[PDB]
Amino acid sequence: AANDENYALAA
Amino acid sequence: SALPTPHEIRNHLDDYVIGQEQAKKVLAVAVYNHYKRLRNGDTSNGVELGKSNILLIGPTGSGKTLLAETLARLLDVPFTMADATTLTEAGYVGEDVENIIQKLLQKCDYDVQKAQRGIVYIDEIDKISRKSDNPSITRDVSGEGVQQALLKLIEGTVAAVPPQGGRKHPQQEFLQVDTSKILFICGGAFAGLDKVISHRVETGSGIGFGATVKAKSDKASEGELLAQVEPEDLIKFGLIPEFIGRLPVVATLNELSEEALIQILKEPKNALTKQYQALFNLEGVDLEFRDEALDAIAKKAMARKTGARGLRSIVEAALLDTMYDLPSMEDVEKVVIDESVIDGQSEPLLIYG
Amino acid sequence: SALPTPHEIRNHLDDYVIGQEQAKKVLAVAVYNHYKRLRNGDTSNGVELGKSNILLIGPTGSGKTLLAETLARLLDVPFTMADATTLTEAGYVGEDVENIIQKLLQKCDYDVQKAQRGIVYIDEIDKISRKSDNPSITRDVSGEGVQQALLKLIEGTVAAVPPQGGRKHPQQEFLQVDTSKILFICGGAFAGLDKVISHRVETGSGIGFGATVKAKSDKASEGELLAQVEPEDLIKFGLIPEFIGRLPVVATLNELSEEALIQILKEPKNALTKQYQALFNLEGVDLEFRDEALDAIAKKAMARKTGARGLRSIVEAALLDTMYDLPSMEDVEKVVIDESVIDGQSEPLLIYG
Ligand SMILES: Nc1ncnc2c1ncn2[C@@H]1O[C@H](COP(=O)(O)OP(=O)(O)OP(O)(O)=S)[C@@H](O)[C@H]1O
Ligand SMILES: Nc1ncnc2c1ncn2[C@@H]1O[C@H](COP(=O)(O)OP(=O)(O)OP(O)(O)=S)[C@@H](O)[C@H]1O
Beta-strand pair B119-123/C119-123: unpaired
The answer to whether the beta carbons of residues B287 and B277 sit under 8 Å apart is yes
Say how far apart CA C339 and CA C296 lie, in whole Å.
7
Q: Which residues pair with C350 in a beta bridge?
A: C335
Picking from A4, B97, A3, the residue whose alpha carbon sits closest to that of residue C166 is: A4
The answer, for B124 touching chain C at a CB cutoff of 8 Å, is: yes
| Ramachandran sector of residue B167 (left: φ over 0; alpha: ψ -120 to 50; beta: rest) | beta
The answer to whether the CB atoms of B165 and C160 lie below 8 A apart is yes
Helices and strands, number each (H, E), in chain B = 16, 10
Other C-beta atoms within 10 Å of C218: how many? 4
Question: b/e string for B228-245 if b means 16 or more Cβ within 10 A?
Answer: ebeeebbbbbbbeeebbe
DSSP for B273-293, written as a single string? HHHHHHHHHTTT-EEE--HHH
Say how far apart CA B328 and CA B286 lie, in whole Å.
16
Which residue intervals of B130-257 are DSSP H helices?
144-155, 193-202, 222-227, 231-237, 241-246
Distances (CA, A) of C104 to B170, C82, C88, C288: 33, 10, 19, 43
Distances (CA, A) of C212 to B203, C4, C205: 34, 56, 8
B60 annotated binding-site participant = yes
The answer to whether the beta carbons of residues C129 and C89 sit under 8 Å apart is no
Say how far apart CA C201 and CA B294 lie, in whole Å.
26
Question: What is the SS3 assignment for B186?
Answer: strand
Which residues in chain A have their CB less than 8 angstroms from residue C168's CB?
1, 4-6
| Ramachandran sector of residue B111 (left: φ over 0; alpha: ψ -120 to 50; beta: rest) | beta
What's the resolution in A?
3.7
**What is the 3-state composition of chain C as percent helix, strand, coil, each rounded to the nearest 5?**
45, 10, 45
**What is the 3-state composition of chain A as percent helix, strand, coil, each rounded to the nearest 5?**
0, 0, 100
Question: Angle between the B21-39 and B6-14 helix axes, to the nearest 10 degrees?
Answer: 140
Question: What is the SS3 assignment for C186?
Answer: strand
Angle at B272 between CA B270 and CA B273, to 5 degrees: 100
Please tell me the residue having the least CA distance from ligand 1 atom 13.
B61
Which experimental technique did the depositors report for determining this structure? cryo-EM
Say how far apart CA B257 and CA B301 lie, in whole Å.
10
Picking from C278, C283, C287, C223, the residue whose alpha carbon sits closest to that of residue C256 is: C223
Beta-strand pair B183-188/B175-178: unpaired
Of all ligands present, the nearest one to the C-alpha of C48 is: 1
| Ramachandran sector of residue C110 (left: φ over 0; alpha: ψ -120 to 50; beta: rest) | left
Question: b/e string for B264-286 if b means 16 or more Cβ within 10 A?
Answer: bbebbebbbbbbbbbbbeeeebe
User: Exposed, middle or buried by CB within 10 Å (0-12, 13-18, 19+), for B260?
Assistant: middle
Question: What is the SS3 assignment for C254?
Answer: coil
Picking from B11, B4, B16, the residue whose alpha carbon sits closest to that of residue B70 is: B16
The answer to whether the beta carbons of residues B333 and B286 sit under 8 Å apart is yes
Of all ligands present, the nearest one to the C-alpha of B82 is: 1
Q: Which residues contact C22 (CB under 8 A, 6 or more apart)?
A: C251, C252, C253
Measure in Å the smallest separation between the Cα of C242 and chain B Cα atoms. Answer: 6
E-strand ranges in C52-189 read 54-57, 79-83, 119-123, 160-161, 175-176, 183-188
Say how far apart CA A7 and CA B11 lie, in whole Å.
56
Which atom of ligand 2 is found nearest the CA of C271?
4
Chain breaks in chain B (C to N over 2.5 A) after: none
The answer to whether the beta carbons of residues C294 and C302 sit under 8 Å apart is no
The answer, for C170 touching chain A at a CB cutoff of 8 Å, is: yes
The answer to whether the beta carbons of residues B187 and B125 sit under 8 Å apart is yes
Which residues in chain A have their CB less than 8 angstroms from residue B170's CB?
10
Q: Which residues contact B164 (CB under 8 A, 6 or more apart)?
A: B102, C170, C171, C172, C173, C174
Question: Angle between the C258-266 and C272-281 helix axes, to the nearest 10 degrees?
Answer: 30
Cα atoms in the Cβ-side hemisphere of radius 13 Å centred on C89: 21
Of all ligands present, the nearest one to the C-alpha of C265 is: 2
Say how far apart CA B224 and CA B205 lie, in whole Å.
19
Give C81-118 as a 3 state SS string: EEECCCECCCCCCCECCCHHHHHHHHHCCCCHHHHHCC
The answer to whether the beta carbons of residues C194 and C225 sit under 8 Å apart is yes
The answer to whether the beta carbons of residues B134 and C133 sit under 8 Å apart is no
Q: What is the H or E stretch that residue B187 is in?
A: strand B183-188
Phi, psi of B183 (to 5 degrees): -105, 140
Distances (CA, A) of B205 to B139, B197, B201, C299: 36, 14, 11, 59
Beta-strand pair B183-188/B54-57: parallel
The answer to whether the CB atoms of C172 and B191 lie below 8 A apart is no
Q: What is the H or E stretch that residue B176 is in?
A: strand B175-178
Say how far apart CA C154 and CA B95 lie, in whole Å.
20
Nearest residue in chain A measured CA to CA from B94: A11
C63 annotated binding-site participant = yes
The answer to whether the CB atoms of A6 and C167 lie below 8 A apart is no
The answer to whether the beta carbons of residues C186 and C122 sit under 8 Å apart is yes
Angle at B153 between CA B190 and CA B43, to 5 degrees: 115
Q: Which residues pair with C336 in a beta bridge?
A: C288, C349
Touching B (3+ Cβ pairs <8 A), the chains are A, C
- B134 closest CB neighbour out of C89, C98, C138: C138
The answer to whether the CB atoms of B309 and C36 lie below 8 A apart is no
Question: What is the SS3 assignment for B54?
Answer: strand
Angle at B217 between CA B214 and CA B220, to 5 degrees: 85
The answer to whether the CB atoms of B83 and C160 lie below 8 A apart is no
Say how far apart CA C229 and CA C252 lie, in whole Å.
9
Q: Which residues contact C85 (CB under 8 A, 6 or more apart)?
A: C124, C127, C128, C142
